[PDB]
C-alpha cells in the first residue's frame, strides 16, 4: 500500500482530519507514518487500529523522501521550510497541504472536488503533484452557491462575512470564551436582579470590555460583545486585507477562470462565533430566472448544500452556527431578488470552517490519490 506521511496530525485541523479519517476508515488502504516537530521517538498514536512505529522528525528529509504522499496540517511556516528542501532532492511524491503557503504556486492545484473535480483530474494527468486546500471562506461559498458558477450564471459576487474565532486559531477561540465569561461576570448579580437598570448593566459590561485586564492579546481588540472588520494583513495596492483578496484570487483559480475571472470582493469581519463562518451575498446574475429555479440549481450542485426556505422559524433553526457546527452540512437561505433588479440575488450561508473549510477537501484528495 502507498506510504503516506502525516504532519500536523496533532493540531486543531489535524485532529479534525484524523477523526474524519477514522469515521470513514481512510487508514485501511494506506500505510500511515506519523511525524512530529516536538515528540520524535515517542509512541505514535493509534488510528485505524494500526500501530505506526515511533514518531519521526517532520524535518527528516531522508524519511520524508521515502513517502509516496505527504499530508500536512502543520502550517505555512513548516511547508515553506521543508517542501523546497524535499523537492530539491528530486522527490516526486504527492504533497497534500491544508496551509495556504503553496496555493498560488504555478505547479499547485487548489482542491475542492465537489466543485472543481475536472480541474483536479486534469491536473493529475498533466502531472500535478501538489494539492492544497482552499481558503475556508471561499471554499464554503462555492459549496453553497457552486451551482450558479456551474451554470455560468454569476457576473460578480459582493460578500460580507461573519467569521468565527476558530478560524484564527485554537488560542483565539479560547480568548473569545474568556471574554464572554468576563463580560457576564462583570454584571452577574445585576443580571439576576429584575429591578436593575439595563443602562447600568451596559455601562459595566462596556467598561470591562475596555479595561486593561480584558484579554485582547490575540485579536488586538475585543471580540466577545463586539466585532473586528479586519482579518489578516493589508494589501497596499488595492486596500483589501489578505482574507478579502482570497475571494478573487482563489475562486478563479479553483474554478479555472483566470482567463475570464469573475469579480468576487467584499469585507471580511470577525464576530463572536466559535467555529462556523457565515456569509451574506449580493449575487449579480447574468440572467433573470425564477427564484424557484435558482434554488433548484443551487440545491442540486452537491449533496452537502441545503437550501433553507425563507421562513422565520425554519431559518432560526437551520441557518445558524449553533446548528451547523461540527456537521458537513452547508445551509444557504434568505434567497430572494434584491431591489436593484431581478438579476440581483440575495443569499446567506453558514458552514463549519474546519470541515469543508479545512479538513474535508484534504481528506478527500488523499482518498483519491490512494485506495
Ligand X SMILES: NC(=O)c1ccc[n+]([C@@H]2O[C@H](COP(=O)([O-])OP(=O)(O)OC[C@H]3O[C@@H](n4cnc5c(N)ncnc54)[C@H](OP(=O)(O)O)[C@@H]3O)[C@@H](O)[C@H]2O)c1
Ligand Y SMILES: C[As](C)(=O)[O-]
The three-point CA angle 30-330-123 to 5° equals: 45
Q: Examine residue 225 and tell whether it contacts its own copies (CB under 8 A).
A: yes
**Shortest distance in whole angstroms from residue 47 CB to ligand Y:** 23
Instruction: Please say which residue, 154 or 358, places its beta carbon nearer to ligand X.
Output: 358
- In what side-by-side order are the strands of the sheet with 31-36? 56-57, 31-36, 3-7, 69-72, 94-97, 130-133, 108-111
DSSP letters, 86-115, are HHTTT---EEEESSSTTTT-TTEEEE-HHH
- Compute the CA torsion angle 198, 200, 205, 206 (nearest 10 deg): 110
Breaks (C-N over 2.5 A) in the chain follow: none
Instruction: Please say which residue, 36 or 329, places its beta carbon nearer to ligand X.
Output: 36
Q: What is the Cα Rg of the chain in Å?
A: 22
Q: Binder to ligand X among 41, 53, 169, 341 (CB under 6 A)? A: 169
Restricting to residues 346-365, name those near ligand X by CB under 6 A.
353-354, 357-358
Task: Single out the segment in contact with ligand X by CB under 6 A; choices: 82-90, 167-175, 247-255, 316-324.
Answer: 167-175
Q: Binder to its own copies among 60, 122, 293, 311 (CB under 8 A)? A: 311
DSSP structure class, residue 49: T
Torsion angles phi and psi, residue 79, rounded to 5: -55, -50
Q: Which does 246 bind (CB under 5 to 8 A by kind): ligand Y, its own copies, ligand X, none?
A: ligand Y
Rounded to whole angstroms, the Cα distance separating 213 from 209 reads 9
The residue ranges that bind ligand Y (CB under 6 A) are 100, 135-136, 167, 246
Q: Examine residue 38 and tell whether it contacts its own copies (CB under 8 A).
A: no
Residue found by looking up cell 483536479 in the block: 120
Q: Examine residue 8 and tell whether it contacts ligand X (CB under 6 A).
A: yes
**Shortest distance in whole angstroms from residue 336 CB to ligand X:** 25
Residue found by looking up cell 475570464 in the block: 260
Q: Which does 38 bind (CB under 5 to 8 A by kind): ligand X, its own copies, ligand Y, none?
A: ligand X
Restricting to residues 280-299, name those near its own copies by CB under 8 A.
280, 282, 284, 291
Torsion angles phi and psi, residue 149, rounded to 5: -75, -40
Restricting to residues 77-106, name those near its own copies by CB under 8 A.
none
Binding residues vs ligand X (CB under 6 A): 8, 10-14, 36-38, 73-76, 98-99, 136, 166-167, 169-170, 195, 353-354, 357-358
Amino acid at each position: 500500500m502507498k506510504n503516506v506521511g502525516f504532519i500536523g496530525w496533532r493540531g486543531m485541523v489535524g485532529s479534525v482530519l484524523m477523526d474524519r479519517m477514522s469515521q470513514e476508515n481512510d487508514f485501511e488502504n494506506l500505510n500511515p507514518v506519523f511525524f512530529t516537530t516536538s515528540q520524535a521517538g515517542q509512541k505514535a498514536p493509534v488510528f485505524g487500529g494500526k500501530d505506526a512505529g515511533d514518531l519521526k522528525s517532520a524535518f527528516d528529509i531522508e524519511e520524508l523522501k521515502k513517502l509516496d504522499i505527504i499530508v500536512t496540517c502543520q502550517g505555512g511556516d513548516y511547508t515553506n521550510e521543508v517542501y523546497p528542501k524535499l523537492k530539491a532532492t528530486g522527490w516526486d511524491g504527492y504533497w497534500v497541504d491544508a496551509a495556504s503557503a503553496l496555493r498560488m504556486k504555478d505547479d499547485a492545484i487548489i482542491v475542492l472536488d465537489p466543485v472543481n473535480q475536472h480541474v483536479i483530474s486534469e491536473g493529475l494527468k498533466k502531472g500535478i503533484k501538489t494539492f492544497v486546500g482552499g481558503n475556508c471562506t471561499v471554499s464554503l461559498m462555492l459549496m453553497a452557491i457552486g451551482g450558479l458558477f456551474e451554470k455560468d450564471l454569476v457576473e460578480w459576487i459582493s460578500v460580507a462575512t461573519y467569521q468565527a474565532a476558530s478560524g484564527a486559531g485554537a488560542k483565539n477561540m479560547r480568548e473569545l470564551l474568556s471574554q464572554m465569561g468576563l463580560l457576564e461576570q462583570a454584571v452577574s448579580s445585576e443580571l439576576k436582579d429584575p429591578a436593575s437598570s439595563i443602562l447600568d448593566i451596559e455601562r459595566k459590561v462596556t467598561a470591562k470590555m475596555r479595561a486593561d485586564n480584558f484579554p485582547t492579546d490575540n485579536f488586538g481588540a475585543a471580540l466577545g460583545g463586539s466585532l473586528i472588520p479586519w482579518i489578516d494583513k493589508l494589501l497596499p495596492e488595492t486596500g483589501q486585507t489578505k482574507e478579502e483578496w482570497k475571494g478573487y484570487a482563489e475562486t478563479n483559480k479553483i474554478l479555472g477562470l483566470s482567463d475570464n475571472p469573475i469579480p468576487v470582493d467584499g469585507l471580511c469581519v470577525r464576530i463572536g462565533a466559535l467555529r462556523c463562518n457565515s456569509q451574506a451575498f449580493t449575487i449579480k446574475l447574468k440572467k433573470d430566472l425564477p427564484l424557484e429555479e435558482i434554488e433548484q440549481i443551487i440545491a442540486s450542485h452537491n449533496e452537502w448544500v441545503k437550501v433553507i426556505p425563507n421562513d422565520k422559524e425554519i431559518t432560526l433553526r437551520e441557518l445558524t452556527p449553533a446548528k451547523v457546527t461540527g456537521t458537513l452540512s452547508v445551509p444557504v437561505g434568505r434567497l430572494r431578488k434584491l431591489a436593484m433588479g431581478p438579476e440581483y440575488l440575495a443569499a446567506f450561508t453558514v458552514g463549519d470552517q474546519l470541515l469543508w473549510g479545512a479538513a474535508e477537501p484534504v481528506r478527500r484528495i488523499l482518498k483519491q490519490l490512494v485506495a
